[PDB]
Amino acid sequence: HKSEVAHRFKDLGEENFKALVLIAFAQYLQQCPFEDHVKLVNEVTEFAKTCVADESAENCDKSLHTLFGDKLCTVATLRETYGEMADCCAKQEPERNECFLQHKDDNPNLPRLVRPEVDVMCTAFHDNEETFLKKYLYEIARRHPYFYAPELLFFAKRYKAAFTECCQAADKAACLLPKLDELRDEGKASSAKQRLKCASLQKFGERAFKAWAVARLSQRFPKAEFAEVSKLVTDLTKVHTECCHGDLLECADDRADLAKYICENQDSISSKLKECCEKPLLEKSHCIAEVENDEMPADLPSLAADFVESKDVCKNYAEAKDVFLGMFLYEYARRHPDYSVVLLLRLAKTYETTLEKCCAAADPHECYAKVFDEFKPLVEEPQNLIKQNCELFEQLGEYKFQNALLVRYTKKVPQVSTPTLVEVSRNLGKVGSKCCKHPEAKRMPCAEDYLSVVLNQLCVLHEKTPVSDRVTKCCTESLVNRRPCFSALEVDETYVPKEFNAETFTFHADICTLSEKERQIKKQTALVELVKHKPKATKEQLKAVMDDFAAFVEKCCKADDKETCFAEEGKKLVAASQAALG
Ligand SMILES: CCCCCCCCCCCCCC(=O)O
Ligand SMILES: CCCCCCCCCCCCCC(=O)O
Ligand SMILES: CCCCCCCCCCCCCC(=O)O
């Protein structure tokens, strides 16, 4: 239309438009205070209303990109505050937009957002919901300048719903703090998952990216024909490519274009899209990305005929290797929503390797007649890890499961930092409690999804402060080999026990006072150090010290003198332990 502002304003609606403009400037003027942004928003919003009344009104025909940069260049202190960013303004439009993109600061130096008291939060929420939510919306977005704006908005609406429900409850903190934790974790995960898409594309290329998409969409839309899955994969890959480049309007337009093609082609795609396809422009593409897997056709044969038994396997393969392999991924994927995408990819690569070797062999048909047998152990490996970890988790609770893991991994990579070991072991543990809750059918997809985040966070930390080549090996390997790489780590026999540190195994009565969280953390911190000082300590020995420590803590927490107790019982416990371990 003549006016991009007016058209966006109309299908977004005033409220969404204003939130979106606020997020958009916050991510670029990360050092301007909230009031300045509220001022920008009001000005852009007034102007937008001008174009809605009259598409022909002044400057209404300019692109949003132009209007956005004009506004940015309008900021008084732009130069004093942002230096080089101000130079973008000297450029003509196409170049200016690309220049602004380059000068977002990724890790802006602001203090951490501290969670205030439930009482002070609810009071603020009550006293002025808008400023309360928009200011925190501003704070978050200036700290996460690459977080997709509409996804940040979808989160903010969930925070809104949390306060609404909890600030008028009964035990506010009881209701609210668990929701805030969930929101925070979820949001951290979505951010890491977004950066992971772009980096994986960069490091591993379009072909790998598309392979991944074939598998996933095939599971999602098993009724769609390969041709339609492959059209979707091509467009999906284009979308991510544009989005990783980082221009928000272009990302949003590409995302919206894909959703409406999908919505216009439901019958060729999935029977599940009705609800998503009736949602407004803003939530449509997001609804589709999360839609339940559709039911598979039911009368599906067996891959043997097309992929093993058929003469023409090598002919069909040679004629279009990636298409053939992609048809193979397709057919296996739609039959197996129960697998993780990465396993499907292992199978595809195994099938590929076999064909490479077999179509150049004396007798191809005999050569690959048994390729399906090679899939068995690949499949069975994650399935057995699930059963073993989930059984253990059913014996031990979550927390004693986290302890099991902590003893497990400290022995494998005892060089890793204690905090990193505690953190990662606690995270792996949640993955357990969560995914083990599902029936067998949804466990691997579950594990894959959350393992990608935990394992990515681990490699991110380790890449910034390397410590074990092995850890670094698993982190840099293909995303398909990553979890198996970590799984294949064993006990570090190279390791020289950490020398005894008295203070490390000293406790005070404040432990009786910490929250449940920080008490676990301090116990688990000590548990790691225990395994670090005595690495060859046995499972039976370890429990004996753990039961003593537990008793120790209970005793000195109940005593008419806690502190004195922690000190004297404390020396007893330690000496007794230093002896129990040979
Ligand atoms: C002029 C200020 C720029 C404001 C940018 C807000 C527009 C964002 C629209 C996002 C629409 C979502 C599309 C989608 O993800 O499917
Ligand atoms: C982690 C999900 C956050 C939403 C993604 C933000 C940017 C979207 C670009 C690609 C959108 C297509 C998503 C997909 O269906 O794979
Ligand atoms: C050599 C001194 C050993 C005593 C200090 C080690 C304490 C280990 C902490 C055990 C924590 C397990 C969790 C729990 O007790 O519930």
Swiss-Prot record:
Phenotype upon changing K370E: In Naskapi/Mersin/Komagome-1
Record annotation: effect of changing R112G: In Yanomama-2
Albumin domain mapped to chain residues: 1-184, 185-377, 378-575
Modified residues (N6-succinyllysine): K203, K434, K517, K562
Tissue: Plasma.
Binding site for (4Z,15Z)-bilirubin IXalpha: K238
Record-listed Cu cation binding positions: H1
Main subcellular location of this protein, as a coarse class: secreted
Family: Belongs to the ALB/AFP/VDB family.
Name this polypeptide is given: Albumin
The organism of origin for this protein: Homo sapiens (Human)
UniProt lineage: Eukaryota, Metazoa, Chordata, Craniata, Vertebrata
